[PDB]
């Protein structure tokens, strides 16, 4: 029922690693302060996305057993999850409680940031569906670790090795879902279902960058590797 001492140790370790990220307040304060051009927002995006990948690699390296994995599988896991992890973190940031009217202004600013119309609606639909779950910080951290340690990622040679590392994280998350939401026995299943919805963002992530309403689409060499853009 309750977390065991080993699970409590695992949870605080994942939380400490997860907390090394930029505070949501920092990101939203920047976007709410003043409106920027599509060109200025494109550069803000590439800076933030580059920093997110760097922080994600350090978080991933700290995941128990990750560094014991086959090196090619390590690359396949990071490359397969980087985009999904960024959208999950964007959903967390979007659903953080702000003063009256601020979340509406934040949504309006992102809606007019330069991103194409085709990608706007699905993005906010995902953020609002994530928001309805009313996830705790621990749920976001564990869910991010579960996304990274996905054994059914493309090019993974040894699935079982990845399964073994993901399994205890799923066990902790399931227990937390039962504790934080005993009224909703579907909470855990819903979280896992949202991970399938996250995967549809990989299908058009490169296009979301390429279709940004700017004249030139300059990317950092690290972003080119992770987002499949030139």
């Amino acid at each position: 029922m309750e977390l065991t001492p080993d699970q409590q140790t695992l949870l605080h370790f994942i939380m400490d690693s997860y907390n090394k990220q930029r505070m949501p307040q920092e990101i939203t304060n920047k976007i709410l302060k003043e409106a920027f051009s599509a060109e200025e927002n494109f550069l803000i995006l590439t800076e933030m996305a580059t920093n997110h990948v760097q922080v994600l690699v350090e978080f991933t390296k700290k995941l128990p057993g990750f560094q014991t994995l086959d090196h090619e599988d390590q690359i396949a896991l990071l490359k397969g999850s980087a985009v999904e992890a960024m959208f999950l973190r964007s959903a967390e940031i979007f659903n953080k409680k702000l003063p009256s009217g601020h979340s509406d202004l934040l949504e309006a600013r992102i809606r007019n940031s330069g991103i194409s119309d085709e990608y706007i609606t699905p993005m906010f639909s995902f953020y609002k569906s994530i928001g309805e779950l009313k996830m705790t910080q621990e749920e976001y951290a564990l869910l991010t670790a579960i996304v990274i340690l996905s054994p059914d990622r493309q090019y993974i040679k040894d699935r079982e090795a990845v399964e073994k590392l993901q399994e205890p994280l799923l066990d902790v998350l399931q227990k937390l879902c039962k504790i934080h939401q005993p009224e909703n026995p579907q909470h855990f299943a819903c979280l896992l279902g949202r991970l399938t919805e996250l995967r549809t963002f990989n299908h058009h992530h490169a296009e979301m960058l390429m279709s940004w309403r700017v004249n030139d689409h300059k990317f950092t060499p690290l972003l080119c590797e992770i987002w499949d853009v030139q």
Binding site: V57, H71, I75, P221, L222, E225
Partner: peptide, 12 residues
């Protein structure tokens, strides 16, 4: 060929 990702993974 994920040269930078490889470097970030293999450093330290």
């Amino acid at each position: 060929d994920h040269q930078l990702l490889r470097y970030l993974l293999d450093k330290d």
